Amino acid sequence: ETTALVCDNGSGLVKAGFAGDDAPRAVFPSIVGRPRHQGVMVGMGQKDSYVGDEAQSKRGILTLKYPIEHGIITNWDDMEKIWHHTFYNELRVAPEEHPTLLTEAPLNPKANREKMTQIMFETFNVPAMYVAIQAVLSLYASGRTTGIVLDSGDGVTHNVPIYEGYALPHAIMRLDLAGRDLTDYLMKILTERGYSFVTTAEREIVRDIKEKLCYVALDFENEMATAASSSSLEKSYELPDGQVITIGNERFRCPETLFQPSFIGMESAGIHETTYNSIMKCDIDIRKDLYANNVMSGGTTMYPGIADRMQKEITALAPSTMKIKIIAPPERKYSVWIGGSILASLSTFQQMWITKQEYDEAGPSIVHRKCF
Amino acid sequence: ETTALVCDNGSGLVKAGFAGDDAPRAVFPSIVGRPRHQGVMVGMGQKDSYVGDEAQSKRGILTLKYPIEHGIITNWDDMEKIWHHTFYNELRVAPEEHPTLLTEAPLNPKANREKMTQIMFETFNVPAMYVAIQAVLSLYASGRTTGIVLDSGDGVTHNVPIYEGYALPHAIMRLDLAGRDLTDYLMKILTERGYSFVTTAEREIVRDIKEKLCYVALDFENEMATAASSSSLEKSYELPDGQVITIGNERFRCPETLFQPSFIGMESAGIHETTYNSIMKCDIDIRKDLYANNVMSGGTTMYPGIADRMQKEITALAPSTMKIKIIAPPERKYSVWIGGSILASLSTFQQMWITKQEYDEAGPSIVHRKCF
Amino acid sequence: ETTALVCDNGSGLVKAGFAGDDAPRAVFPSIVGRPRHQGVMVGMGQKDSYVGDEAQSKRGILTLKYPIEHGIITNWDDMEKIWHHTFYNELRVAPEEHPTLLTEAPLNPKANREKMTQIMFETFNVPAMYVAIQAVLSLYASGRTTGIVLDSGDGVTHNVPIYEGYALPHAIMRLDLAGRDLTDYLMKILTERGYSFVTTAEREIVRDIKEKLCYVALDFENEMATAASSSSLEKSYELPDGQVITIGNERFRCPETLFQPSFIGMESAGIHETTYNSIMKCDIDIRKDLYANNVMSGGTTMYPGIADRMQKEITALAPSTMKIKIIAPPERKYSVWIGGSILASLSTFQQMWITKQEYDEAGPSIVHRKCF
Ligand SMILES: Nc1ncnc2c1ncn2[C@@H]1O[C@H](COP(=O)(O)OP(=O)(O)O)[C@@H](O)[C@H]1O
Ligand SMILES: Nc1ncnc2c1ncn2[C@@H]1O[C@H](COP(=O)(O)OP(=O)(O)O)[C@@H](O)[C@H]1O
Ligand SMILES: Nc1ncnc2c1ncn2[C@@H]1O[C@H](COP(=O)(O)OP(=O)(O)O)[C@@H](O)[C@H]1O
Ligand SMILES: [Mg+2]
Ligand SMILES: [Mg+2]
Ligand SMILES: [Mg+2]
């Protein structure tokens, strides 16, 4: 083949393009939007459903659904609209000509991967495809064969240890807390300063407040004290319609949910303890190299101060005699897709695709014997 | 102390009285009103503002302002008249004599609770006070350590799950739709039958139409079909001055907004879906006992048929494997205040009051470190 | 004494009672749990810690901690709550009056036995005590003085060869895989069918799924092929909250971790290989009588088909010239406690107790010269 696609069919935001390009060709919301009002205009070019940037643009008149929840596809009829849009609108390919690398979280339901395999061969007729783990792809972008990858998206956070190119699948950790739960918690805490955000259109406004204003405080109790000497840490922000809102300790109490999942009431260890537990499930000789190669990936790792905070916290859990080093590159917003564009381009990978001629004799069950 | 005051400082309607009474000593409109017409009579007892039953009585000559919107005090200069009137006129006690229990919605703005705290210690000089969640009080009145309380007053509808007396604040739900929004919708749909209601006093006339004649259908499409065999479900009502109006399917299409908020153009779950979502956000082992102890509170839960409609709808959402039971007691019009009268009476509660001596060294910020 | 106590302080299930009784007087979860939510009701039995069935019953609002991990007590402040509950709450004895037989896995830390001795004399003031090896007690319940015992609890699996009443301590094997690791692996593989169990309360739901439905395949590859021609091996389970989960090959792929520890990623012999390797470490003349007396003990030996599988596999490793018999009694769930109740009742054992008079001139290091 001369060109494959790589599609990072993620929660909240899809990244899409071709193998061997250095960054995604297309990046848009993993959203389908549907009207919630009467179509009172006549001769208007009214469309029954909107997807990606069209839905994000028109959202005052729409109800917005993400067809992926926690890295699991929950609405296949609208997920087919996202893949149809992806290929025919801004990639503008013929899917029958290009083999597609697809992307998934570890410890997902098998039925997700099977129906995703079925749609690619039976609805899009692709030549071939493969499903790769987001955290395995994240080491190709880094240029490594050992590291522990913390990947944190819109839906799921997960840790995957790799040493000398072998995964330790028994030491993988998954966590149903990422960019959506932080946005919902930001909506909840913004209520107590007097602002209301509740519609699926207002959750997108609060996602922009989260992306623009929020950060990870290197010591939470000292930052909560600092914010009581107020206006020192406060930022103003301008809503659609031009009303201004101001934010204080909620600017960093929001991202702290990653380190203290008890803020959203769940009983699980923080992302620091989860990375440390994942290294401690690994065999003793590999732990020293995993601590030094603690890779970060995905948009929920983009906060200011989060690499510093997690270096402070893994260094408090690990023994003091060795170098915890956290590798947070500036393109980590796309390092899954970038690593998929490398893998789909490798000359040795071209024998590993599931081909149409191998699917159609074995059914969607083929994807469990041929993929990790 | 020998007695304590207790107030549900309600949206639309205040309830007030003393600890250990089995019902409120006073219940009256949460209203202040000012003249909108000339005082032409010389030697008249002319007065520049009115409150409660006095404003409700003079409402031909007044414009009526509710100083509480959606459970938030939006007009302190008139809310201070409501609290002043409450203590000095129909409770007729000196506020410095008795500590006050006070009442709030969950997820409210912190500035509301702070300013309420300040006014009680600095305008009314009370010995001590506390602020309690309307739904936590409703389990004291119902005699339970566990339940999910749907509370629906004039201004707000909210759900609080409680199990073994511990609340789950991650699973709390709040909804800016209750008795006011149903009254505004009733003005709009009575206008489809040609009746005009637009002044604030006409909203009180339409509120009496709602309170006297409205009800919840067990199945809306069957009731809308039944109303096409007309004059069966329809009723007649007598206005002030003695004119009469006849009320059609708007008699049950009004309360159905609680189950279909899209009738008033907002994009949110109905009260059945939001109570189910609140149970489904809880820890799995507690859900069986929340379905069995679903408690109704506040005047917007007083419609005929609402318990039967909600038992039907929650039974359709929940798995059939277990017994949904909705506890709608007849005193649920006052169950918040009744629960406060129990809480203020308990010997083990008297250490939980914020005392004047504990406020004046910490300011109104004391309330967030002693209330829920 | 007229009665001693015997307390099999095992991982995650404590079995306790009097010497001379035929079964444990008390059996309960070896668990302590603490609230993880705000207590909003007051005038109530609010309690800062729950233990045993109180923790297991209220688990929907608790984080649950096991104070024993792999047969090692890791949290003594909660193990003292388990013994205090054992003695005062449902044995309802005064410990000062009764000598107590305690119990431990072989190849444990010496400090675990020392601190366990210290607490019994300095916190509970017992007249005397002893620490027995759980596999030596499994021969006492079995009514034989030669055999090899596969004991497998919640924390640890171990083999102890005994011939003519002498143990062969060079031939003891210990494996840090038993009922907890199988439960945790079932949480992992249930995720691949779409069910997330993640809290320490949901781990108890998965432990009940494991106990009710899981079984050991006689031939794993034949059973996997049988489950691929599906629906014949599937069963379903009703959760708390009344949602139903169906379970298929994960019903027997879970217990196969005992025969293939590489499923949880650990490098070791399976329980068949570890038992055979233990017989091979023994002196050649005893091996015939060890194969003829392969005793099984503890709850992780309770799966349907495990005796048939374990006999099938030892019979393939051992030479065909002689007969393997596996002795898996129907009471084997309590055979350590039953055998401890026999040992503590023997007239020949009453010289072997460590007495308070013999502890308080030697310190807790007495337990290394007087016990096993
Ligand atoms: N600069 C930023 N600060 C904070 N959050 C961000 C930033 N950029 C993106 N995000 C968040 O990252 C989440 C998804 O990013 P991504 O890694 O693409 O996840 P996914 O792989 O699930 O699509 C979104 O919820 C978005 O709000
Ligand atoms: N019989 C009734 N039918 C319908 N609505 C009622 C009835 N009685 C009271 N209400 C409504 O209940 C609302 C407030 O009741 P209440 O429970 O006191 O709320 P709050 O606690 O907010 O004061 C008012 O808007 C009123 O219209
Ligand atoms: N019928 C059963 N089938 C499978 N596992 C069981 C059964 N009964 C008990 N267990 C398991 O046995 C384990 C502990 O049993 P036990 O022998 O008391 O161990 P311990 O001595 O460590 O307390 C628990 O993890 C439980 O899940
Ligand atoms: Mg991602
Ligand atoms: Mg109320
Ligand atoms: Mg045991």
Numbering used by the authors:
A (entry chain K), B (entry chain J), C (entry chain L): 4 to 375
What does the published report state?
Arp2/3 complex is composed of seven protein subunits and nucleates the formation of actin filament branches on the sides of preexisting “mother” actin filaments. Elongation of these branched actin filament networks powers eukaryotic cell and organelle movements. Like actin, Arp2/3 complex is an ATPase. ATP hydrolysis and release of the γ-phosphate from Arp2 and/or Arp3 regulate the turnover and mechanical stability of branched filament networks.
